[PDB]
Structure formats: structure tokens, C-alpha cells
Design a binder for this molecule. Structure first.
Ligand SMILES: O=C(N[C@H]1COC(=O)[C@@H](NC(=O)c2cccc(O)c2O)COC(=O)[C@@H](NC(=O)c2cccc(O)c2O)COC1=O)c1cccc(O)c1O
Ligand SMILES: [Fe+3]
Length: 281
């Protein structure tokens, strides 16, 4: 049993352990994917494990849907450690802590290394994590010099459509740490002023008038309004967008269930973003 430090809080956990239950932290599912960690408990999406996670969920029971942990089922698992999420309200984190030692994994994308390092420390995979991290940084380094200086000066936006609504995120959240931080594009004022995931109207978006828009849309997250995207696409206000008219809308260039603040989300978005913002004469 070892004392693990994660974001200035220490936790006492048997290390290494196979008995890890992930609930809420889709970030940790993505870290588990690249570290080849097969958790005892994993997050279900619309009741199943996505094909992209099937290699690591072969020993997993579902811990519940992302935002609806099943405390009873997690209790039944008797896990060594629970990887929860900082997005959970305190009430829910505390309910989860009755099942075992609970570490809320950060949804702040600037903590991607720390999140990976935590899972590595739990599984004794520190070397493997170091390599994944260093390969992203080399990848970023080579991709950057390829990125064209016109696109760098441009106004680009990442939006995610949930329950029919359009959301934006802070500068250090979701894919934005890669778009504005790593790639160096200028965050729009609306992103800079955002304090968390926040609703933006199509009407307001028409005023922002970005040069490029990455739209993330998961059918699982839009059960009420499954036409949310096709509805937007037929809307005269959407059709007035510079990005739309210039064919600079990129729908799901990364899987819509990707969370942004993880090694795996970063490498994917880096590649997709570089694709859309490169050229040749
Ligand atoms: O800033 C983010 N949230 C804010 C703001 O998000 C919201 O207010 C709402 N939210 C969605 O409707 C949402 C609809 C469909 C899908 C959603 O994910 C929704 O969030 C409600 O969620 C919640 O109230 C709470 N939330 C979870 O419990 C959760 C638990 C586990 C896992 C979660 O994702 C959770 O939200 C807390 O939400 C927040 O603090 C935020 C950022 C980056 C990425 C996020 O996902 C964020 O939510
Ligand atoms: Fe959320």
C-alpha cells in the first residue's frame, strides 16, 4: 500500500492494483486505453462499451452511465480505488466514497499529464506513461512547423452539441488547450470569458462569425433532440456563418465521445486540426 499524491491531495491505495473502477471520468477511460489498463469497472454509454474501448473492457462491469454512477454496483465491486470526476457535484463524490477510496480525476485539460501519471502509478506503468507523453510532445513539435501561418491568425471555435444545445468551453478545457494552447490560435473572447461548459445561442455564434468550427455531436448525448445538428445545418442563421459558407465546418473530426484533456484526445485532435489547417502550392 502506497501514498499517492494527485493534485496536492494524497490518497492511500494498494499499488499496483487490478481493482480499479472508473465512473464519470471518461478521461481515465482514454488514459486506460493507451496504458492498456483493463479496469474492473468502466463507464457505459447508452448501456454499452464503445467499440474503441472493447480491448480494455473485457474484464469490466459497467459503473453506470457517465453522469449517473451506480453506487450499489460499485459497492458490489469492492474496488481498491475509484477514479471519479471533478465534474461530479460534492454530494455524488461523497456517495461514491462510501464504496472505496475515491480520486476525482480533473476535467481541466492542462492536467492531462497528471491524470495519465496517476493511472500509471496505480498500475506500475510509469515508463509506458512517460513514453506516451514524450511522443505527444515530439508529435506536437513536428506538427507545429507544418501548420500554416494563415490558419494560425484565424478565429477557430470548438462546439459540442448536447441535448439540442450548443456549448463552448474555457481556454484550458476540452480540446481548447490543444487548439489555442499547443497550436497557438487566438481564443475568442467568449472562450476567454467562459468559466465552465456554457451554453451559447446560434444567434450569438452568428455574431462571433469564426473562420473555422469543429462541431462534436454524439447521438447518445442528444436523445431528446437527435436532429439537433441537421436542424442547425438547415437554419438560415447557421448558413450565414463564414465558416459554413467556406466549407470550414468539421463534424466529428475526433470521436464525439472524446473528452479533449487526455493524451489520446490531444494526439487525435492535433492530427485532425493540422489536417484542416494545412496546405500546399
Ligand atoms: O463544465 C462542465 N460542466 C459543468 C456544467 O455542466 C452542466 O451544468 C450540465 N451539463 C450537461 O447538461 C451535460 C449534458 C450532457 C453531457 C454532459 O457531459 C453534460 O455535462 C449539467 O451537469 C452538471 O450539473 C454537473 N455534471 C456532472 O455531474 C457530470 C458528471 C460526470 C461527467 C460529466 O461530464 C458531468 O457533466 C456539473 O456540470 C458542471 O460543473 C464540463 C466541462 C467539460 C466537459 C463536460 O462534460 C462538462 O460537464
Ligand atoms: Fe459534462
Amino acid at each position: 500500500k502506497k501514498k499517492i499524491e494527485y493534485l496536492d491531495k494524497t490518497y492511500e491505495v494498494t499499488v499496483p492494483t487490478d481493482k480499479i473502477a472508473i465512473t464519470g471520468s471518461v478521461e481515465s477511460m482514454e488514459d486506460a486505453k493507451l496504458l492498456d489498463v483493463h479496469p474492473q469497472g468502466a463507464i457505459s454509454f447508452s448501456g454499452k462499451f464503445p467499440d474503441m474501448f472493447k480491448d480494455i473492457t473485457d474484464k469490466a462491469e459497467p459503473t453506470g452511465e457517465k453522469m449517473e454512477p451506480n453506487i450499489e454496483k460499485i459497492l458490489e465491486m469492492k474496488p481498491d480505488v475509484i477514479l471519479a470526476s471533478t465534474k461530479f457535484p460534492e454530494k455524488t463524490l461523497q456517495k461514491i466514497s462510501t464504496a472505496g477510496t475515491t480520486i476525482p480525476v480533473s476535467h481541466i485539460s492542462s492536467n492531462w499529464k497528471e491524470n495519465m501519471m496517476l493511472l500509471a502509478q496505480l498500475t506500475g506503468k510509469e515508463k509506458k506513461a512517460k513514453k506516451i507523453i514524450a511522443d505527444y510532445e515530439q508529435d506536437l513539435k513536428e506538427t507545429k512547423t507544418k501548420i500554416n501561418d494563415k490558419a494560425k491568425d484565424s478565429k477557430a471555435l470548438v462546439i459540442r452539441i448536447r441535448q439540442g444545445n450548443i456549448y463552448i468551453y474555457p481556454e484550458q478545457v476540452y480540446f481548447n488547450s490543444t487548439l489555442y494552447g499547443d497550436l497557438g490560435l487566438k481564443a475568442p473572447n467568449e472562450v476567454k470569458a467562459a468559466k465552465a461548459q456554457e451554453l451559447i445561442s446560434l444567434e450569438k455564434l452568428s455574431e462571433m462569425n469564426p473562420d473555422h468550427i469543429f462541431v462534436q455531436f454524439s447521438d447518445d448525448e442528444n436523445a431528446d433532440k437527435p436532429d439537433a445538428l441537421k436542424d442547425l445545418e438547415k437554419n438560415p442563421i447557421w448558413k450565414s456563418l463564414k465558416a459554413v459558407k467556406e466549407d470550414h465546418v468539421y463534424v466529428n473530426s475526433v470521436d464525439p465521445l472524446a473528452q479533449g484533456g487526455t493524451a489520446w484526445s490531444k494526439v487525435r485532435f492535433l492530427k485532425a486540426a493540422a489536417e484542416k489547417l494545412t496546405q500546399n502550392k
